[PDB]
Amino acid sequence: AVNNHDMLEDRLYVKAAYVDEGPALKRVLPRARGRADIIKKRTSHITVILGEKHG
Amino acid sequence: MKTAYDVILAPVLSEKAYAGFAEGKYTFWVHPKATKTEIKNAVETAFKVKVVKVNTLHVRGKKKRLGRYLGKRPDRKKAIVQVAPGQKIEALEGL
Amino acid sequence: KHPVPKKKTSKARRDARRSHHALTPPTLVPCPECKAMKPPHTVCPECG
Amino acid sequence: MRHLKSGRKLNRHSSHRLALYRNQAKSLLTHGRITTTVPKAKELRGFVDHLIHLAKRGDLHARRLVLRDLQDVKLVRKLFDEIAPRYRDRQGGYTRVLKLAERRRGDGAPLALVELVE
Amino acid sequence: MKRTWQPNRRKRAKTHGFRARMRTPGGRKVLKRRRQKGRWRLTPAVR
RNA sequence: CGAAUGCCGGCAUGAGUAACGAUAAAGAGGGUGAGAAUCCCUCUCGCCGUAAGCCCAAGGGUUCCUACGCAAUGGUCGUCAGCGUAGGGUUAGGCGGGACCUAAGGUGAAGCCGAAAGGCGUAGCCGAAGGGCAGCCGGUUAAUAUUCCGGCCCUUCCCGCA
Ligand SMILES: [Mg+2]
Ligand SMILES: [Mg+2]
Ligand SMILES: [Mg+2]
Ligand SMILES: [Mg+2]
Ligand SMILES: [Mg+2]
Ligand SMILES: [Mg+2]
Ligand SMILES: [Mg+2]
Ligand SMILES: [Mg+2]
Ligand SMILES: [Mg+2]
Ligand SMILES: [Mg+2]
Ligand SMILES: [Mg+2]
Ligand SMILES: [Mg+2]
Ligand SMILES: [Mg+2]
Ligand SMILES: [Mg+2]
Ligand SMILES: [Mg+2]
Ligand SMILES: [Mg+2]
Ligand SMILES: [Mg+2]
Ligand SMILES: [Mg+2]
Ligand SMILES: [Mg+2]
Ligand SMILES: [Mg+2]
Ligand SMILES: [Mg+2]
Ligand SMILES: [Mg+2]
Ligand SMILES: [Mg+2]
Ligand SMILES: [Mg+2]
Ligand SMILES: [Mg+2]
Ligand SMILES: [Mg+2]
Ligand SMILES: [Mg+2]
Ligand SMILES: [Mg+2]
Ligand SMILES: [Mg+2]
Ligand SMILES: [Mg+2]
Ligand SMILES: [Mg+2]
Ligand SMILES: [Mg+2]
Ligand SMILES: [Mg+2]
Ligand SMILES: [Mg+2]
Ligand SMILES: [Mg+2]
Ligand SMILES: [Mg+2]
Ligand SMILES: [Mg+2]
Ligand SMILES: [Mg+2]
Ligand SMILES: [Mg+2]
């Protein structure tokens, strides 16, 4: 913000922000009586969007 | 033809290789089919030395991968040779 | 034996389950000497 | 219930939870300040205060007593000769527990400080 | 508990081996098929 | 194409739930590192001890040693690893097996039988954790050692001499 878009740090707030869901990596979890489920270790796309306070 | 220069591939370069220079003992990479007897003459003929004892051992190459491409490096044999006492190989004396 | 759910539970009903799941922010007090922030009745990361 | 039952088991049986307090004490009477979890800390407290108080009594008996737990002649000497003396005009409260503001990770556990007083 | 694969390198070369297959017409036809399908390994690999 | 407990794929629910795999047990100080309950060192505690220690044979196949790494693999974490990359490392006349023997059985000149493919079979040949055959003790490397080195012994073949 400061360093690129010349935003003046002292008045920064968090305008909007959110995490969408990335592609999930699947792995095999061996189970009783030969069974083997699959568990998914997932992925987040985190987004913080900053804007300037008006004071 | 098979000449001596075929039996002898290259010198082995390692701490452990070097560490034997100081006794009579010089170790090369040799062709994998080459027997203790003929390795001797091949080294006599090439470096004009007397050979007294031969030690061979095979070095089976490492499996390596380029990423879905999986194969192995080629297989070797090495000899560590004993020159007659006092003889040297000045060829091999650059450390 | 081996009880099972009878119906996929709805997007409405699982989200309402979660109405309590929301976090609450850490409890924080201004520090005695340094400028910074601290949890109360603890030893300040700066100037303990 | 628990109901006026007092004193902690912390996920240890009798044997191991004894050996715990003994070991904690050995380490406090060595380093003079220590860092553990908030509850392990709060239970140490009295376990040393008595160990200390007995060094303040000074006699051959009170020594032989303290050796049951601390087990080590040298550490005991430090206790009787060089530690208890700072306390002789002090009535109780030879230790202090302050909690640290950060907690472990992969653990989450809150930690505290245990130091001998002054 | 004792299970079905008890690897032994002699048994393997003696049973599924190349000279094995070649001794019996049943087994020459094993090799013929495998060769025709274009198998990479015509015969079990024992070390 | 809406249904076939259809087929292939993808994404949900149960749910932040059950579990995280022997109840032998941990605590602290210090180091390293962007980051440490989980790595390294010290101290204390606990558990194996006809083993949960050490050798050998299978089987496995570089997993060994060391440097640089942490995306994934590791039921957490990881700065660690049996993991990624790379380099190095396995040395024998006497140890094991072969240029020795035969065993079951296999195979097989001779021979015998069977539409064909094949089945049999003497002698021979093959076949071993059996018979036979000469190396003990130390030291050395990050990593091999009855293999290299030190000391003290031995076998067979070839040639010569008595
Ligand atoms: Mg399971
Ligand atoms: Mg199974
Ligand atoms: Mg599912
Ligand atoms: Mg040619
Ligand atoms: Mg050899
Ligand atoms: Mg009860
Ligand atoms: Mg618990
Ligand atoms: Mg007990
Ligand atoms: Mg049995
Ligand atoms: Mg199976
Ligand atoms: Mg075998
Ligand atoms: Mg091919
Ligand atoms: Mg229809
Ligand atoms: Mg429920
Ligand atoms: Mg529950
Ligand atoms: Mg649970
Ligand atoms: Mg457990
Ligand atoms: Mg540091
Ligand atoms: Mg640092
Ligand atoms: Mg015993
Ligand atoms: Mg093996
Ligand atoms: Mg395997
Ligand atoms: Mg590998
Ligand atoms: Mg290792
Ligand atoms: Mg390292
Ligand atoms: Mg990783
Ligand atoms: Mg992980
Ligand atoms: Mg590695
Ligand atoms: Mg033979
Ligand atoms: Mg010969
Ligand atoms: Mg024979
Ligand atoms: Mg036959
Ligand atoms: Mg027969
Ligand atoms: Mg034998
Ligand atoms: Mg034998
Ligand atoms: Mg022998
Ligand atoms: Mg070793
Ligand atoms: Mg020895
Ligand atoms: Mg020797």
DSSP-assigned states of every residue in E1-47: ---S----HHHHHHHS-HHHHHHSHHHHHHHHHHHHHT-S-SS----
For the four alpha carbons of D64, D68, D72 and D78, in that order, the dihedral sign comes to negative
- Whether C39 sits inside 8 A of D101 (CB atoms) is yes
Asked whether D101 and C39 are in contact (CB, 8 A), the reply is yes
Cβ pair B57, B39 in contact under 8 A: no
Compute the count of residue pairs across chains C and D with CB atoms less than 8 Å apart: 15
**CB–CB of C37/C30 below 8 Å?**
yes
**Strand F contact at CB of residue C21, distance < 7 A:** yes
CATH class of domain segment(s) B1-95: alpha beta
In the 8-state DSSP scheme, what is residue C43?
B
Looking only at the bridges linking them, the beta strands covering D95-103 and D110-116 are antiparallel
For this entry, resolution in Å reads 3.2
The angle at the Cα of C23, spanning C18 to C26, to the nearest 5 degrees, equals: 170
- Is D108 part of any domain? yes
Tell me if residue B50 falls in helix, strand or coil. Answer: coil
C43/D contact by beta carbon, under 8 A:
yes
| Residue at D5 is within a domain | no
Residue D1 lies in a domain: no
Residues making up chain C, counted from first to last: 48
CB-CB contact of E13 with E46 (8 Å): yes
Q: Does C27 touch chain D (CB under 8 A)?
A: no
| D86 occurs within a structural domain | yes
Put simply, whether C42 touches D (Cβ < 8 Å) is yes
Rounded distance, CA D99 to CA D115, Å?
A: 11
Q: Classify strands B63-65 and B70-72 as parallel, antiparallel or unpaired.
A: antiparallel
Question: CA of A34 vs C1' of F109, distance in Å?
Answer: 58
In this complex, the nucleotide whose C1' atom is nearest to the CA atom of residue B63 is F62
Residue D92 is part of a domain; what is its CATH number?
A: 3.90.1030.10
**C45 has a chain D CB within 8 A of its CB:** yes
**What's the number of domains chain D is made of?**
1
Touching subunits of A (3+ CB pairs, under 8 Å) are none
- Structure tokens given for D8: 């902690």
CA distance, residue D113 to nearest chain C CA (Å): 9
Distance (Å, whole) CA B24 – CA B37: 18
| Long-range contacts (CB closer than 8 Å, 24 or more residues apart) made by D11-15 | none
Residue D47: domain span: 14-118
Gap from D60 CA to F100 C1', in Å? 83
How far apart are the C-alpha atoms of D16 and D22, rounded to whole Å?
10
Cα Rg of chain E (Å, integer): 12
The candidate with the shortest Cα–Cα distance to B94, out of B16, B18, B8, B42, is: B18
Does D62 map to a domain? yes
**Strand order in D33-37's β-sheet?**
D33-37, D110-116, D95-103
**Residue D37: count of CB within 10 angstroms of its CB:** 17
Would residue D2 count as lying in a domain? no
CA distance E43 to E28: 12
Separation of CA D15 from chain center: 17
Instruction: Give me the residues paired with residue B77 across strands.
Output: B58
**Is the residue at D65 inside a domain?**
yes
Chain D residue with CA closest to C43: the answer is D100
